[PDB]
Amino acid sequence: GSHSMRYFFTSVSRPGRGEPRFIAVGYVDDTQFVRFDSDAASQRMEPRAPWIEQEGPEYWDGETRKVKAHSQTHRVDLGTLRGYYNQSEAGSHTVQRMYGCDVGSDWRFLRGYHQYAYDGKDYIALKEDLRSWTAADMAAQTTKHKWEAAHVAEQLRAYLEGTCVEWLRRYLENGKETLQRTDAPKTHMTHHAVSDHEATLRCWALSFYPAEITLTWQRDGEDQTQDTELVETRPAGDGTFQKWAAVVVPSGQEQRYTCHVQHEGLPKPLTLRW
Amino acid sequence: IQRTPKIQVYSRHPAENGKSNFLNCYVSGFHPSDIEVDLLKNGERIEKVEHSDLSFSKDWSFYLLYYTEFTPTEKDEYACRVNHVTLSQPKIVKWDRDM
Amino acid sequence: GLKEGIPAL
Numbered sequence: 001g002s003h004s005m006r007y008f009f010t011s012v013s014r015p016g017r018g019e020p021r022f023i024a025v026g027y028v029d030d031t032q033f034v035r036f037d038s039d040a041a042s043q044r045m046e047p048r049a050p051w052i053e054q055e056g057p058e059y060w061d062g063e064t065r066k067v068k069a070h071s072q073t074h075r076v077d078l079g080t081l082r083g084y085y086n087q088s089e090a091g092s093h094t095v096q097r098m099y100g101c102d103v104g105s106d107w108r109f110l111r112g113y114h115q116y117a118y119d120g121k122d123y124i125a126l127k128e129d130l131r132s133w134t135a136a137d138m139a140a141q142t143t144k145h146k147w148e149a150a151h152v153a154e155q156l157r158a159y160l161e162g163t164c165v166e167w168l169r170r171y172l173e174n175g176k177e178t179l180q181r182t183d184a185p186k187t188h189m190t191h192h193a194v195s196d197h198e199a200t201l202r203c204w205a206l207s208f209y210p211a212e213i214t215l216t217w218q219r220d221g222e223d224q225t226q227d228t229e230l231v232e233t234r235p236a237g238d239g240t241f242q243k244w245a246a247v248v249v250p251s252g253q254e255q256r257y258t259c260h261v262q263h264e265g266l267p268k269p270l271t272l273r274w
Numbered sequence: 275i276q277r278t279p280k281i282q283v284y285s286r287h288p289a290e291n292g293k294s295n296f297l298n299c300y301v302s303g304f305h306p307s308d309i310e311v312d313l314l315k316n317g318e319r320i321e322k323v324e325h326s327d328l329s330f331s332k333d334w335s336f337y338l339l340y341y342t343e344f345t346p347t348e349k350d351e352y353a354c355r356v357n358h359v360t361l362s363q364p365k366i367v368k369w370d371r372d373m
Numbered sequence: 374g375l376k377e378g379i380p381a382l
Contacts, residue, residue: 092308204370204373237296
């Protein structure tokens with residue numbers, strides 16, 4: 001399967017006193033591996049997976065240096081946007097940035113990302129060709145012009161196509177025991193009777209990794225989306241994920257229905273029946 | 275922009291009385307990031323509650339996991355209380371114990 | 374690992 005490395009940055013201005021709250025997190029696939037929080041005592045990039053703790057002091061000094069510089073960029077960004085949108089210094093505002101790279105099963109570059117939002121709305125995004133920009137409004141147009149004049153797309157492309165994938169490959173090897181392991185879902189069904197005429201069947205998928213999964217219901221071998229509910233995939237808290245799907249059925253016809261589970265860790269999809 | 279949080283309250287493992295477990299309150303799909311989340315045991319706020327590092331989805335909406343160690347019993351009721359700018363009253367979601 | 378520098382808006 002494909003793999004990814006992604007960094008997520010959030011800065012929130014604090015108008016009453018002091019500088020913005022800055023939080024940075026890094027993921028390989030669905031595994032968080034580093035964090036920085038401006039409100040934390042260390043003022044260091046910190047590990048959040050065992051395999052990154054293998055990295056020595058020079059790594060941690062470099063990532064701390066870079067993340068603090070990222071923090072200052074976002075501080076300045078909040079100021080710039082306040083000017084572009086003619087807002088006062090009274091209100092709190094948010095900037096968000098995400099960047100990173102995808103590789104395929106062969107670990108070769110697949111796609112790169114670098115995109116930005118202000119107060120939860122699209123601001124500017126690097127297009128898939130890594131050579132042009134999607135600017136959502138006239139403020140973002142001004143940024144696009146600046147970045148086009150300074151050859152920013154070329155700088156980001158070099159990182160996203162090269163250094164980024166080199167980092168990802170290094171992490172995939174160093175964290176092979178978990179990062180290259182798939183955890184297949186542990187599945188079971190439950191039954192809930194609301195009346196003498198109605199029953200709910202729920203199909204559970206637990207303790208799986210990666211997070212991507214498909215749960216589907218069939219009646220008599222054909223798909224059914226009606227009278228079905230599918231919850232958002234949720235973290236178990238131990239690195240794995242959970243999901244359920246439910247279908248409302250006439251009491252006594254439970255046996256007609258089947259839940260089907262598709263996941264990377266399953267060579268063949270599973271079928272469950274009450 | 276303002277987006278109201280989605281809330282799920284659940285255990286890490288299938289719950290059994292007397293067996294140590296983790297109680298999770300997953301809050302997602304919200305903006306802005308300022309949010310107040312408490313875990314409740316029989317209406318009272320639990321003190322030893324940790325949470326994940328703030329991150330966000332493709333659509334820029336935030337998500338957080340709040341969690342604490344707990345040992346379920348037959349009698350004890352658990353819940354998650356969330357306050358956010360989009361909510362007029364704090365939202366209380368009860369742990370159903372369905373799995 | 375993070376990029377060596379990110380662009381300001």
